[PDB]
């Protein structure tokens, strides 16, 4: 009757890059779980804490919904344990994490032939990201003795690269889109219920 | 001046156990993406490990539970442990530096050999 | 994963001449993820190129690479004699990655 915003998050025309995750808190509002499937590719629905079949009898405090995109290779680091480039330099989830993460094949949007290169994720940084830590600085990346001055080159890097979606590359190389749903309960009231 | 000098090679019974280490110059071990890649006598190669700038680190699976990458920031010195050393481990080890998409593996070591055998 | 099948195992070519090798990726990954090294006997390998066409600094002119999706090229446009050598092609941006058999340059008489 007052439907959460769940719409814009999943069905959002544009997603960001993952370096720059979006966050939408979510809260005095019903919360239906049950719509959230969308006839995707590739599917996946997976949550911690909490059983995913009976979500819509449970209340919280406030919920969060980040979105990001990235290659579906790295799909498997977007859970509670996981290192490697995406959990360790740009979305990492907590190893007591609570709540669930849904991901599916979006070749047919995020591809073009030619290339799409407006997705971005950070290849170099000095040290892991904490748990939800979103870190979106531009600073060239000094991998050696001599300082970078803001000019790329021998031993610095600029940290960010582009992917580059083509519908016919694999797909472990193909765009994926990814929502990550946190629960929160607190001495407070609830105001996210099923 | 940038250079990856090894050491660490020898001669080993199935079993054993050997350190290589791997010092640097001219690039800073804990900033970077460190490997080891290996060679076989006659083939081609062979990725083996890699230590994150983070600390991160990955195995080839037919090393895993054997094998430990590491550093040491304050020697600016890469390390591979190797235990359980097998027969198929004979091969010839380089480090080397990984840049991933933004170069390649643009500096390697000269390499150190291992053999294993009874 | 990713399979890389280089192409041909060995060439046979004489000074001057203009030589093509070939990598071929299983499955089809961005241009950005390919490298190309050479080695000689005894010798550590050397990056030559990477994301496929850039020429890494201090490597002649007369390499140059291409390609995308699955078929990738290294080309040198007139062979030295210190060209005769083994060429690898590798993934990269993956762990563990890939690497291409090799392609030996040999000489021709």
């Known amino acids: 009757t007052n439907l959460c915003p769940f719409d814009e998050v999943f069905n959002a025309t544009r997603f960001a890059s993952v370096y720059a995750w979006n966050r939408k808190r979510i809260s005095n509002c019903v919360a239906d779980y049950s719509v959230l499937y969308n006839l995707a590719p590739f599917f996946t629905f997976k949550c911690y804490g909490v059983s995913p079949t009976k979500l819509n009898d449970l209340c919280f405090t406030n919920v969060y919904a980040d979105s990001f995109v990235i290659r579906g290779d790295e799909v498997r680091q977007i859970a509670p344990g996981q290192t490697g480039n995406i959990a360790d330099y740009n979305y990492k989830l907590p190893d007591d994490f609570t709540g669930c993460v849904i991901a599916w094949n979006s070749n047919k949007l995020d591809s073009k032939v030619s290339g799409n290169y407006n997705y971005l994720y950070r290849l170099f940084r000095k040290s892991n990201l904490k748990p939800f830590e979103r870190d979106i600085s531009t600073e060239i990346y000094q991998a050696g003795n001599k300082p970078c001055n803001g000019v790329a080159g021998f031993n610095c890097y600029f940290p960010l690269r582009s992917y580059s979606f083509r519908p016919t590359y694999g797909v472990g190389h193909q765009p994926y889109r990814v929502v990550v749903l946190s629960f929160e309960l607190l001495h407070a009231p609830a105001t996210v219920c099923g | 001046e940038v250079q990856l000098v090894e050491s660490g090679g020898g001669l080993i019974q199935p079993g054993g156990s050997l350190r290589l280490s791997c010092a640097a110059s001219?690039?800073?071990?804990?900033?970077?993406?460190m490997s080891w890649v290996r060679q076989a006598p006659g083939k081609g190669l062979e990725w083996v490990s890699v230590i994150y700038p983070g600390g991160s680190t990955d195995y080839a699976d037919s090393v895993k539970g054997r094998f430990t990458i590491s550093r040491d920031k304050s020697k600016n010195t890469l390390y591979l442990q190797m235990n359980s050393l097998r027969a198929e481990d004979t091969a010839v080890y380089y480090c080397?530096?990984?840049?991933?998409?933004?170069?390649?593996?643009?500096?390697w070591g000269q390499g150190t050999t291992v053999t294993v055998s009874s | 994963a990713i399979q890389l099948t280089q192409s041909p195992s060995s060439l046979s070519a004489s000074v001057g001449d203009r030589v093509t090798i070939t990598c071929r990726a299983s499955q089809g990954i961005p241009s950005s993820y390919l490298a190309w090294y050479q080695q000689k006997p005894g010798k550590a390998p050397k990056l030559l190129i990477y994301?496929?066409?850039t020429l890494q600094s201090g490597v002649p002119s007369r390499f140059s690479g291409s390609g995308s999706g699955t078929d990738f090229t290294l080309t040198i446009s007139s062979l030295q004699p210190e060209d005769f050598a083994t060429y690898y092609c590798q993934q990269l941006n993956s762990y563990p990655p890939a690497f291409g058999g090799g392609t030996k340059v040999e000489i021709k008489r």
């Open positions: 994301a496929a066409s």
């Open positions: 001219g690039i800073t071990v804990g900033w970077n993406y």
């Open positions: 080397a530096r990984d840049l991933g998409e933004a170069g390649g593996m643009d500096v």
